[model samples]
Target: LTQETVINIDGMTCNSCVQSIEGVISKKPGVKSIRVSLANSNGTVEYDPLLTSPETLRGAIEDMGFDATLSD
Candidate 1:
């Protein structure tokens, strides 16, 4: 089934940060949508588990020089 979750991200300082997050995640196969907040330093993503996992999502964000944690 498709899953929706909130991820806590750190190190977003500007619109570029938001854009970069969206740009990269948007390209992932299972990613359906992403809404990133530079102000709150978090983002909500909806994706398919069969194609992607939250850990992979976290890695993607981390690879871009940010810290990512799945919300509780």
Candidate 2:
């Protein structure tokens, strides 16, 4: 079944941080959709479990140069 994951991000003091992360995740395959909220420093993603994994998603976020950890 499809799955959703939330990553807690640190150092996202502005929009640029969010854009950097959102850009990378959006480009990845199987990423159905993504939303990053600065207010809570969390990113909610809807994705295909078969096509991607949480590790991959976390990697994508890390590539943007921020600290991330599974929040839920």
Candidate 3:
């Protein structure tokens, strides 16, 4: 099933950070949509859980030199 989750991120300071996150995660197989806000320091992602998991998503974000956590 598709799941929508909010990710709390750290270290994003500008639009480039947003672009980088979107660019990378967009390449992942299960990602359906993503919206990031530099001002908010968080993002919402929609994906297929059967194809990917929250850990993978966190990896993608942290890979860009930032921190990521699943929002409660």
Candidate lDDT scores, in order, read: 0.90, 0.83, 0.87
Q: Best lDDT goes to which candidate?
A: 1
Q: Estimate each model's TM-score.
A: 0.93, 0.87, 0.91
Q: Which residue runs of candidate 3 sit more than 4 Å off their true CA positions? A: none
lDDT tens digits by residue: candidate 3, 1-72: 799889999888889998888888888898998898898898788999988888889887887788899887
Give per-residue CA lDDT, model 2, range 1-72, as digits (tens).
778899888878898877877887887888888998888897888889888878888887777777878885
Pairs of residues clashing in candidate 2: none
Between candidates 1 and 3, the lDDT winner: 1
Question: How does residue 60 of candidate 2 score in lDDT?
Answer: 71
Models sorted by lDDT, best on top: 1, 3, 2
Cα-based lDDT at residue 46, candidate 2: 85
Model 1 lowest lDDT segment of ten: 4-13
Candidate 3 global lDDT: 0.87
Name the lDDT of candidate 2. 0.83
